[PDB]
Amino acid sequence: AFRVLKPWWDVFTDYLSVAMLMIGVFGCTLQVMQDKIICLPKRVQTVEMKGLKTDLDLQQYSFINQMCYERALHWYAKYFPYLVLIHTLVFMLCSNFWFKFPGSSSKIEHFISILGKCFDSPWTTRALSEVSKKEGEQAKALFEKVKKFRLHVEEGDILYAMYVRQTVLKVIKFLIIIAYNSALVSKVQFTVDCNVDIQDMTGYKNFSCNHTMAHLFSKLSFCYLCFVSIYGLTCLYTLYWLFYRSLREYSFEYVRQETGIDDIPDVKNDFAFMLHMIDQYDPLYSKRFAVFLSEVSENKLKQLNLNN
Amino acid sequence: PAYRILKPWWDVFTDYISIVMLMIAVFGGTLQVDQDKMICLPCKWVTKDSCNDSTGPTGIKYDLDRHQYNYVDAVCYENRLHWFAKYFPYLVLLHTLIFLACSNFWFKFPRTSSKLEHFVSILLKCFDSPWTTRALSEGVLDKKEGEQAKALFEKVKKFRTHVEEGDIVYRLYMRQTIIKVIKFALIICYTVYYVHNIKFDVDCTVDIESLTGYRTYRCAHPLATLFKILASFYISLVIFYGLICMYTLWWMLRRSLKKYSFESIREESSYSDIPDVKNDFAFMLHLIDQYDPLYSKRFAVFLSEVSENKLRQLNLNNEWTLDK
Amino acid sequence: VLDKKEGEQAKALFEKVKKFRTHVEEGDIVYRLYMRQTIIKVIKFALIICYTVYYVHNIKFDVDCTVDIESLTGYRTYRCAHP
Amino acid sequence: MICLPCKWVTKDSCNDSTGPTGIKYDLDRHQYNYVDAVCYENRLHWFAKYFPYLVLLHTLIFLACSNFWFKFPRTSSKLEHFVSILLK
Amino acid sequence: YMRQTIIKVIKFALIICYTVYYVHNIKFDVDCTVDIESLTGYRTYRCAHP
Amino acid sequence: PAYRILKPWWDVFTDYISIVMLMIAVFGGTLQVDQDKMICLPCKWVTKDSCNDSGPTGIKYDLDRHQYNYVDAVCYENRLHWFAKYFPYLVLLHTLIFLACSNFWFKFPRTSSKLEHFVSILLKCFDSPWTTRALSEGVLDKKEGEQAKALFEKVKKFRTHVEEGDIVYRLYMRQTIIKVIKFALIICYTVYYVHNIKFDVDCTVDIESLTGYRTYRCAHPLATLFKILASFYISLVIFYGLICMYTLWWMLRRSLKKYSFESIREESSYSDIPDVKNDFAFMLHLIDQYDPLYSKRFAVFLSEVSENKLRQLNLN
């Protein structure tokens, strides 16, 4: 169960990444076959109009097309889809930066197993009814498991640091992408002027060329820019939610407002952050898992087991 | 897969219409990528940048190379051919993607997806439970069967407290339906207004007289009639999608989906303590009724505490045996 | 002979069959749908056969075209081959 | 649609009238392409152009008629319940 | 496993050596002197690899 | 799957070589279909109907594009060697024959049924707990004892049923022989005809009535690429043939129709395991060439002493 730890921003950015992959693949397959330039020499040799004869073979025309595709077309207009592909692959690889390192993955699996096991445990409902046998022994075992989890996760804070590094990397990459794409989006234009020196072959020096797939590349660039802007707004909201509330401290006072138990200790660092994650999924798991943390609940369960 | 119970006939209809519209998008996109050309022929005699249209017949010699013809084609395709004919498949594909995202947003949003999966699980394993059959039919029960029956009873008990308080699923489905209907309105306005601009014969006046020698060219867009019939088919499919979405909106407006009465269930069955459910639980129960009412018929068994007392009595008659 | 489990599941299946019969034998929505699909398929077959048989003779190889593009080409009538 | 001009026109009709030599038409390749496009658009019958698309539409209609039995939720639920009970 | 790792390292070394040595030969403008004057009429042509 | 157990290293090596040759055959076939042409220029200077070929200005041939296409097609069909045209199809056919020879062992119903029976009860003997009990050398479950006795009887019945005829061994030998002869013929004809894949081809096709020229010089675009593919195929066929000769030498090294259980009977307690023969011997040789643990775990069922320990322990 890994999808539970993914909030709305994580799946939103993932689907944005799939959209970016589709855009990059479409741009690449357009650039492989449809991308061509059409060049005509300048200053060439009831009104009856007559066409101008350039006195050029088809091979000379292809040669001019190539010289102007290489030495006149902007590199952005030729390598935009590959840049999109590379950048979105880096985005996809860094999308699960906080999911793939084995220690953090083990912490995720341990926390979700614990939270699901106490979710299935009826002792939570029994204790919530009390405040407001075999399963008792299972609840005691789950409680000592919760204490072991406290001794195993709460003292560390590596998960929060990895998440903040991943978010900062996403934000800085989005800034770079917006910057260079907005700077070079004006270079993708239909009519270009090509001044290569192939006069010794074709006889002309100045050419006017048309990038046939320039309107489509401009629309694709603007769509990719829109997707990048949405991705960056999502990452900026992620950073704002990261920073404006201290996620190294999880407070159970909101549970205390309606639950009488007050011996509940406040967890910190990794526990606090990933309980905030489960709160972002749904606060019910957190306000329900509150009852498994305090020690007077364990003492009450021990007394109940002794009486039974 | 497991969400097929939560998809009524309108959802299935819209899903298949979206599939056909996406097929139209892919077909038009491939055609516009491969064979979308614009064969342009210059007008020999012009009067104020307009073709004059003025012993066997002989061909008109234009003195134009193949590459000058290609240049004229590219210029007039870029400049004078209407944007709708050029970007019809891409706009269609974008609209299909928006429609599919709107339909499947609540299946991917974690806050509603968790509730939906919990509801589907505890209603299906409710449906195949033998206690439902034995209760609706109205001594000894299997130990595993009895423990499972009480486990699903407690699971329904906690699920009711977990879902009835909130209305996130109902509000999300409202918002998705409203967005889909306004998207249909926008599409059926703009596509219908701009569908008449996909014409076969287009005059182009692009001012490339210094590179070609002519100013006006009478072009011909080959995939104009085919794009026209594709646009008409897309308009028909969007009309069907919009009518289905307006039916969904009318269904959601007339009956308050934030309340659900088990009056029909509690009168036919002996159990008359089934409570009236509200909010999101009521909404997905209404959806299940739209799929198959007998699912909710069986699900109402676990909602009545008289059934709880009967199950507790039967389990106590089993837990405490004569021997012990 | 029969086991306790087999008897229990057979009785449960008996009640399931009775409830299924009670819930299904009320109406004929499945029969009506199958009828309607059959009639629609027959009508579609009839229309397809009529229009296709009528218009199949128009798929010819040599087609004479007269499109009036004399101002752009110089000729009026052309003979075309549809490969 | 390979279209060749009829140099001997007789009231909008092809007249169909010393080594042999080919007839010079004095037409560019692009004029030929324009003639092909116009005579394919205007004078080719709509059946010869849209026969496969009509066949595809008819096949999809037939498939929809066949599978609307299993796609309609009420009848799909009824058939699934019947299949489950009869298999059991 | 040791043999596979050794072969992979050796293959990497050879690939890097030959590819770095020969990557400069992928140019755009190449001059060809093929001597087809009997058939074409010219001897030297300057080409361009797309 | 279930048949990977009876596939030794030579078999899997030949399978991987076969799919590699299938891949290069598909590549060559796609190349032949799409980009296989030949550009033919007429020889303006001729001598006894041969290509004399004695600010420069290009030579005018006064040939249309269609006359050039006709010359290309005629010289391609006539004066281009059949190897340079049908090499990928020949490679595809040879690869299909090799794959059919490799997989006919699995498809023929008699041999496939025998293989399935062998694999099935080998898996069952692996799953048998009495295999572990016998290999270690207490308490027996009734179901476990019934399964063990049934497996012992099934082993005896199957041993009697298959040791009479060696159709599987004979089929495998025939497949190996056919594969090695195929490799010999393939390497001979491919080595002979590889030098006919040339770039410059002089064609004299006698189409002077239509084109006006007698002899033409053609360039085959996919000539050296096809030559590289032919050399790669020759290397692959040489590797396949060396593997096939090793497999044939494995057959002829020792009688695969006679398996001796001497080493296992010396290592294990049971020393009465008979020397089985023919198809059972071949099938056991194959799993010995995959993993000797299978024979170690399965030899306990053949021995009567283990049956004597079985009947004593079942009685207890």
UniProtKB/Swiss-Prot annotation, chain A:
Effect of deleting the gene: Mice do not show remarkable changes in body weight or the weight of white adipose tissue on a chow diet, but display significantly lower body weights and fat mass than wild-type mice when fed a high-fat diet. Moreover, improved insulin resistance induced by the high-fat diet is observed.
CC annotations in GO: endoplasmic reticulum; endoplasmic reticulum membrane; monoatomic ion channel complex; plasma membrane
Keywords: Cell membrane, Disulfide bond, Endoplasmic reticulum, Ion channel, Ion transport, Leucine-rich repeat, Membrane, Phosphoprotein, Repeat, Transmembrane, Transmembrane helix, Transport
Principal location class: membrane
Disulfide pairings: C39-C209, C68-C194
Tissues of expression: Expressed at very low levels in adipose tissue.
Residue intervals on the Extracellular side: 186-215
Cellular localisation: Cell membrane; Endoplasmic reticulum membrane
Superkingdom of source: Eukaryota
One Gene Ontology term from the biological process aspect of the record: monoatomic anion transmembrane transport
Outcome of mutating L58R: No effect on channel activity of the complex with LRRC8A
Inducing stimuli: Induced during the earliest stages of adipogenesis.
GO MF annotations, alphabetized: volume-sensitive anion channel activity
Sequence intervals crossing the membrane: 8-33, 78-97, 164-185, 216-240
Family per similarity comment: Belongs to the LRRC8 family.
Official protein name in the record: Volume-regulated anion channel subunit LRRC8C
Species of origin: Mus musculus
Shown chain mapped onto the complete sequence: 16 to 407 of 803
Curated annotation (Swiss-Prot), chain B:
Membrane-traversing stretches: 9-33, 87-105, 174-195, 226-250
Localization (cell): Cell membrane; Lysosome membrane
Disulphide bridges, residue numbers: C40-C219, C43-C51, C76-C204
PTM per Swiss-Prot/TrEMBL: N-glycosylated.
Site (Required for anion selectivity): R66
Effect of T30D: Abolishes activity in hypotonic solution
Disruption phenotype: Increased prenatal and postnatal mortality, growth retardation, and multiple tissue abnormalities. B-cell development is slightly impaired, without affecting B-cell function. Mice however show a cell-autonomous early block in thymocyte development and impairs peripheral T-cell expansion and function. Conditional deletion in germ cells leads to abnormal sperm and male infertility: the cytoplasm of late spermatids appears swollen, preventing reduction of the cytoplasm during further development into spermatozoa.
Tissue: Ubiquitously expressed. High levels detected in the bone marrow; lower levels found in peripheral blood cells. Highly expressed in pancreatic beta cells.
Residue numbers on the Extracellular membrane side: 34-86, 196-225
Residues modified by glycosylation: N52
Domain of life per record: Eukaryota
Free-text domain note: The volume-regulated anion channel (VRAC) channel forms a trimer of dimers, with symmetry mismatch between the pore-forming domain and the cytosolic LRR repeats, a topology similar to gap junction proteins. The di-leucine motif is required for lysosomal localization.
UniProt record similarity statement: Belongs to the LRRC8 family.
Protein name: Volume-regulated anion channel subunit LRRC8A
Boundaries of the shown chain within the full protein: 15 to 415 of 810
From Swiss-Prot, chain D:
Coiled coil, from the record: none
Result of knocking out the encoding gene: Increased prenatal and postnatal mortality, growth retardation, and multiple tissue abnormalities. B-cell development is slightly impaired, without affecting B-cell function. Mice however show a cell-autonomous early block in thymocyte development and impairs peripheral T-cell expansion and function. Conditional deletion in germ cells leads to abnormal sperm and male infertility: the cytoplasm of late spermatids appears swollen, preventing reduction of the cytoplasm during further development into spermatozoa.
TM region positions: 50-68
Stretches of the chain found on the membrane's Extracellular side: 1-49
Modification after translation, per record: N-glycosylated.
Disulphide bridges, residue numbers: C6-C14
Localization annotation: Cell membrane; Lysosome membrane
Family listed: Belongs to the LRRC8 family.
Domain comment in the entry: The volume-regulated anion channel (VRAC) channel forms a trimer of dimers, with symmetry mismatch between the pore-forming domain and the cytosolic LRR repeats, a topology similar to gap junction proteins.
This protein's name: Volume-regulated anion channel subunit LRRC8A
The organism of origin for this protein: Mus musculus
Gene: Lrrc8a
Residues of the full protein shown: 52 to 162 of 810
From Swiss-Prot, chain F:
Subcellular location: Cell membrane; Lysosome membrane
Site positions per UniProt: Required for anion selectivity: R65
Record-annotated membrane-spanning stretches: 9-33, 86-104, 173-194, 225-249
Outcome recorded upon mutating T30D: Abolishes activity in hypotonic solution
Phenotype upon loss of function: Increased prenatal and postnatal mortality, growth retardation, and multiple tissue abnormalities. B-cell development is slightly impaired, without affecting B-cell function. Mice however show a cell-autonomous early block in thymocyte development and impairs peripheral T-cell expansion and function. Conditional deletion in germ cells leads to abnormal sperm and male infertility: the cytoplasm of late spermatids appears swollen, preventing reduction of the cytoplasm during further development into spermatozoa.
Tissues in which the protein is found: Ubiquitously expressed. High levels detected in the bone marrow; lower levels found in peripheral blood cells. Highly expressed in pancreatic beta cells.
Residues the record marks as carrying a glycan: N52
Outcome following mutation: R65A: No effect on anion channel activity. Impairs channel selectivity, so that the channel is also permeable to Na(+) ions
Post-translational modification: N-glycosylated.
Effect of V33 to K/N: Impairs activity in hypotonic solution
Similarity comment text for this entry: Belongs to the LRRC8 family.
The protein's name in its UniProt record: Volume-regulated anion channel subunit LRRC8A
Organism, scientific name: Mus musculus (Mouse)
